[PDB]
RNA sequence: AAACUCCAGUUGACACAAAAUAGACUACGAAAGUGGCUUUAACAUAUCUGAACACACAAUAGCUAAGACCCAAACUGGGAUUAGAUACCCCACUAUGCUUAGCCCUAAACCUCAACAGUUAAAUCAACAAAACUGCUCGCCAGAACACUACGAGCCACAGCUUAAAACUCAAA
Ligand SMILES: NC(=O)c1ccc[n+]([C@@H]2O[C@H](COP(=O)([O-])OP(=O)(O)OC[C@H]3O[C@@H](n4cnc5c(N)ncnc54)[C@H](O)[C@@H]3O)[C@@H](O)[C@H]2O)c1
Ligand SMILES: [K+]
Ligand SMILES: [Mg+2]
Ligand SMILES: [Mg+2]
Ligand SMILES: [Mg+2]
């Protein structure tokens with residue numbers, strides 16, 4: 001059960017990381033992400 | 046480059062009449078028939094003659110830097126073959142740090158000798174980083190994205206103006 | 207195995223005294239440390255226990271020799287009282 | 293002094309020219325490295 | 339540096355021993371060595387039975403070769419001594435005369 | 447029933463738990479097992495140096511593996527003999543050496559089991575799949591179920 | 602009792618295992634560690650201090666790939682045993698102990714004494730331990746338990762490691 005909780009937490013961490021990254025380029029004025037940018041999954045092997 | 050194996054030992058290079066001896070004696074008194082430490086001594090002597098103003102003064106900071114650089118080269122040569130020698134890896138890393146400290150002192154005190162040492166030994170002096178912190182995955186990815194976002198912002202501003 | 211036989215740990219019998227030869231061989235093996243080695247090799251002694259045992263034995267020997275030296279040094283005074291009464 | 297000692301010593305070294313003669317001479321020779329010590333510290337050669 | 343080769347050769351007749359000694363010294367010279375001397379310690383019973391090249395030996399001829407060689411030669415020479423079928427056992431050591439006889443003042 | 451605390455925990459251990467072992471699978475593929483409460487050793491008149499757990503077993507209407515008991519026992523024992531290793535290292539010990547490498551691969555492919563799964567990370571459905579495939583292999587090989595690798599190592 | 606009797610004794614051949622005696626020595630290495638023989642490389646720094654995180658190492662156990670397997674041996678079987686036997690004894694045999702290339706990063710990892718420099722005069726000095734102190738620097742600590750925990754963060758680690766709280770409670774510990 002701790003595996004399910006832990007993997008859900010890792011998913012939420014990845015979502016938070018993506019949200020912050022999006023916040024940055026949205027505030028900078030870019031409507032979309034940098035050309036060719038793709039957020040890597042750093043919290044999953 | 047190493048000294049040629051035919052070169053005489055440091056202790057048998059000024060003996061009078063050393064050039065009037067048999068070829069066998071020359072071989073016996075050459076680097077070919079000795080261990081690596083005599084070759085390192087010859088390297089140190091060559092560097093001292095090429096670099097320092099007074100080659101006899103082994104007490105100066107430049108002489109110490111030359112000696113430690115020769116030792117560092119020896120450790121690197123050892124570790125090229127002995128890749129799992131942790132003790133010698135530690136010795137190499139400590140020696141590099143000590144040479145950096147001596148180079149910093151030399152730069153602060155005598156800039157001309159510092160330049161001469163850096164040129165002669167092929168050393169590229171580098172300034173230390175200001176902050177020591179882990180570059181974990183999140184920070185690396187975030188910094189990459191920030192650099193990129195700055196680049197498209199610059200492109201967009203150039204297009205605007 | 208590769209050595210010559212009947213040289214190591216070999217004793218000759220004198221005038222048919224087999225018991226004396228056997229006891230001499232036992233003494234030789236004891237003072238050469240072979241008996242204690244054989245008896246200690248029957249079961250494995252852990253390195254920490256081995257080190258503790260050797261340290262204890264060495265310090266026991268040193269302490270015993272010092273005590274014996276002290277007793278022997280103080281033995282000289284143990285004689286008849288020269289000032290009996292006073 | 294060391295250089296001169298080596299210079300005089302090399303005259304007796306084994307070379308490709310004198311290999312066979314020296315080999316035979318060694319075969320017809322014996323050298324003994326054994327000696328014993330006494331309780332008094334005196335060397336007793338064989 | 340200065341090295342000493344302790345050679346235990348098979349108990350052979352004089353011509354074969356001479357040939358083996360010549361071959362060994364020639365290998366030393368081919369590896370860059372300068373041979374100083376060759377001492378024959380004699381033929382004697384081995385301290386123990388030695389098995390070499392699918393042959394058992396109880397006797398052997400003991401020889402000493404003093405020489406000067408580059409440090410890289412030693413390893414190579416060892417390999418050669420492993421292949422010579424007439425060598426029971428060859429060992430290269432640093433020459434004991436090079437080792438310095440440090441003097442002491444006695445028991446403290 | 448009362449057990450020692452560790453035995454009760456192992457009987458009622460979930461996947462991934464430090465106490466997941468043979469007893470966990472064997473009890474939980476047939477019963478609903480609940481470790482209700484633990485009694486400390488001080489409460490027993492001659493006080494033991496261990497705690498005591500109370501475990502309730504309720505037999506399941508539908509057992510989670512429809513295979514003979516001894517087959518499941520052998521499979522679970524061979525899976526858990528190397529508890530910290532990959533599961534395939536234990537599974538290969540079910541087959542003779544000659545067909546060890548090939549049979550383990552066939553078993554893992556037919557059962558659809560990730561070889562890198564450790565014994566403590568195997569659910570009862572993974573054991574169901576492995577037991578079914580092992581039953582098929584035993585039916586197709588009459589001498590397989592009686593193989594003991596230790597006896598083969600005796601020779 | 603089981604087991605073996607392709608068993609046992611002498612003799613000969615014969616390791617990828619482990620290194621009597623020396624060692625009653627107290628050495629080398631930053632620590633961990635290091636005690637069969639030979640050889641080659643080789644043991645940083647001529648101020649000192651200087652990091653949970655930077656850079657390099659860390660016994661034993663444990664995990665990936667390959668290999669070796671004498672002996673030992675968690676587990677797994679069998680023999681023998683009270684009256685719920687011996688967990689313990691006997692036999693057989695695994696992981697593992699070994700080598701190669703990578704992980705993991707923990708110890709009563711302890712001299713339970715932080716590094717450098719200095720003193721032996723003072724009242725020596727709570728106690729015990731290991732005589733009592735001084736200068737200077739870094740690290741750390743401010744009642745117990747909650748807690749070598751939860752959450753957050755980092756990690757080739759995935760119920761693992763490092764950092765590390767709060768609430769409720771008590772007059773103690
Ligand atoms: N944080 C730095 O990068 C940094 C840089 C220069 C000097 N220092 C000095 O190191 C001392 C420790 O500072 P802190 O308490 O804030 O660090 P800290 O211990 O609280 O750790 C926070 C960060 O500082 C780094 N750090 C820790 N000790 C350091 C050191 N001696 N040198 C360089 N980096 C270090 C760590 O890697 C970590 O990333 C201070 O005296 C500070 O002046 C720190
Ligand atoms: K201790
Ligand atoms: Mg420092
Ligand atoms: Mg800090
Ligand atoms: Mg480790």
Ligand SMILES: [Mg+2]
Nearest residue numbers: 662663697698
């Ligand atoms: Mg291991």
Ligand SMILES: [Mg+2]
Nearest residue numbers: 670695696697
């Ligand atoms: Mg094994």
Ligand SMILES: [Mg+2]
Nearest residue numbers: 715716739740
């Ligand atoms: Mg410190």
Ligand SMILES: [Mg+2]
Nearest residue numbers: 743744745746
């Ligand atoms: Mg508190």
Ligand SMILES: [Mg+2]
Nearest residue numbers: 749750762763
């Ligand atoms: Mg924790």
